[PDB]
Structure formats: structure tokens, C-alpha cells
Design a protein around this ligand. Sequence first.
Ligand SMILES: [Fe+3]
Ligand SMILES: [Fe+3]
Lengths: 263, 194
Amino acid sequence: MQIGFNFTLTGTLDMVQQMIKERKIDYVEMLIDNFVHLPPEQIADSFDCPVAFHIMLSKYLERDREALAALGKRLRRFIDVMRPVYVSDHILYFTHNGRSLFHLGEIDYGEYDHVRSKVEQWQDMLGTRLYLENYPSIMDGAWDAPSFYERLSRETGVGVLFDASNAICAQNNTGAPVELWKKIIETTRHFHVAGYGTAFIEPRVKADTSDREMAEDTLDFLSRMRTSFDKPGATITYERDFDIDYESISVDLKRLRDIFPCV
Amino acid sequence: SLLPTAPVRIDADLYDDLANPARQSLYPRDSRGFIRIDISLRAYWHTLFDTCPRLLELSGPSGGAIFLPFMAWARENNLAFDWSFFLWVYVWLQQSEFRERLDEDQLLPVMTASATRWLMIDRDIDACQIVLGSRSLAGAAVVGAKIDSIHCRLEQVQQVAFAAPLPLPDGEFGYFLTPGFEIDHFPGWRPLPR
Ligand SMILES: [Fe+3]
Ligand SMILES: [Fe+3]
């Protein structure tokens, strides 16, 4: 298990480079579509470690093809220069009838035929194996998603970026046990982990706010099934998007390495 | 122990109501579908007011006197909640009970908010800076530039003064995009999207 950190804001650089130098993380996952106008060689020369790619806002499920192709070709040039460990993206509903959601929607997994066609086309544009992340479900599509990603992954060669946190959100909001994902966990080698929050008006509903330490059950999940997570090429990226505190992050990182010792 | 999904099952059933605080009531208080809409309305709330806290001096701390009326006015006028979001709030504000209390100190934070949103979410490869103009900001503009170096020690949004006279836009706001990180040319203002 290589441990990673997600680099999203330009002003976290000095701190991220210091966790690299101090061997607290082995690679850097990059929200690459935020840096598409940066010179790609510059990113590779700011990290003395491997990088991986996470794409937030392709909107490949809805974006027009001319804009989508241009993004793909720019991402292709970045893939060539940095050789990312993997390239990943999401399954997200961004836009209802022309207007933008600010809290992104879980796609309706009954729409398999539509997702499949866009995933194939997007992954073709990217020119490489794509990994798709699971939504931190609130509504009951949580019970549908494990069987849906499995299907999508064998008809299209696509990988699953299994985010343990989001699956535990899914469990707490819908009952849908994380065990539903065992076959995917034992297949993919790339994982996400973060802390989750709560709604302002319902502490029982869990939000993917990425702002705090991981829960005691997101750590039980990685502990209980560390054998199924860990495998030869395996990685887990720790996400912290808000309250980016060097010491609060650093203990969650060691907390990860306690679960996955180096040998 | 779980909150019932009650009238619905999956997020797709809730799409139409995720930005409509009027229709939130029609879901049972104890229902999960009520909760999910609330999470999504809070997201619109916080995007508006965390980024532009001085607007709470107008609405009061709950932001209600702006938010509810602006939300319902947004569905009516079918805005896309695009990067022009903030500017579209200020436009609504210009015709609300608050129209007399707008000044530069309210105007500039919403222009910086829309400029930052554009340079964060926009995925057009041949669009490098956005240039925002308003009729309440003569001779100057708010320019939002995408990141083009990991080492820029400056902010990506700047107020810039022009030397040649700059036309007032037709509406309260107008904008244009530049293909690189220079402004060599003024193509004339375009109206706010949506
Ligand atoms: Fe993600
Ligand atoms: Fe994640």
C-alpha cells in the first residue's frame, strides 16, 4: 500500500513537498483539470515522487463533444509527460434541464446504456485505462451501484477507484453494506479515503465534506478487510479538501500506515 | 433508525427540486428526501454567502431576505446557476428592497466571486482570462485568469485599470474572454450568460 495525498489548491505546495521529503506519502494525486494551462513539465519537477490523475470536471456524461475532445487532447499531452500511476474520474450528475447543481447528484444507475456509451467515448479520448469513483450515496441508488460498476467495468475495460469513505457514507445513509463492494475491492488497486461530515439538520445523514479526520468506522473498514484492500500494486489517496492542517493531516496519514505497514 | 426515502427512492427523483426552497416543504420533515434537498440548498446558500459575507449585512444573518426571493426568482427566469451566479444575485439586488444600499463595497466582492468561479469550473481550453465589466465600475474591470504556473505568488483575480476609455456595458454586467494571458484587444462586452 502506497499512501497518497490529493493536491488541489496551488497554495498547499510547500506543505505537500515536505510530506514527500519526509516519506509520509509516496505519490501525489492531482485534480489535474485544475492545472490544464500550467506547463506540464513544471508539475513533474515539483514532486520527487509519482503522480496520479483525478479529473473533477470533465462532465463527460453531459459535455459537448468539441469541448470534451479538446480537454481530452490536453489531458493526453499531460499523460505523456508525467506518466501518471492511474487516470481517474467520476460518475456525476452536474446539470438538470440546463441549470447547475451545486451539490452534485448521484446518477440514476438504471441509465446503464447511457453511462456506458459516454464512458467508452471519454476513455477513448483519454487514450488509457480510466478509473471511475463511486458516489457517496444519499438516496437508495447505493444498493444499485456495486452491481453497476462491476458491469460497467467488464463491458468497458474501465477501472474502479473505490473510495472507502463514500461507501461508508452510502452505508450510513441507506443501509447498503460496504460488503457489497468486496469483489471490487479485491480487484482494483487504487483507493480513496477521507473524513466525512454530517448535514446541518440531520447528524444521521453523512456528507463527503473531506474536512475532518476519518471516522472510526472508515478505519474499521480498512482494518477489518486490510487483506482485501492490500495487493501488489495497491495505493490509497488520503483526501483532505477543507481545514488543510499539516498536523491533523499528518496523524491521519500515520493512522493509514499503521493499517498498511510497509512490508 | 434509517430515514425513510418516503415518496421517492433515488437522487434522480429529487433532481427537479434540488434548488427550489419553496417545494422543499412537500417532502415529510422526517423523510430522507427532505434531508437531501436541504443539503443541496445549504450548498447554494454557502456558495453565495461564504464567498460574499457582506451580503449578510443586507439580508441579516439567516440570509433569508435575499436567498428565498432570489432562488424563486431564479427558477422563474431559468438561470443556469453558471459562473454568473453572483452577478445575477447583484442584479436581483438592484431591483429588491435593498437597491438603495448597494455600493462599491458590495459590488466588488460579487465580481471577484464570479471571476473566481469562472476560473475554477470553466473547462474551455482556448479561454484563459475572463474580463468582467459593470456599469457601476467605470474605466476598470475585474479580470480572472486561470492558473498558468504553480509559482504565481499573486491572486488569480485582479482589478485592472484601462487606459483607453472603456464602454459601459448595456446591462449591469458584461464580460469577455481572452485566448491567452494578455489583453491586447477589446471585442466589446457580451451580456451575462442566461
Ligand atoms: Fe473524487
Ligand atoms: Fe475520493
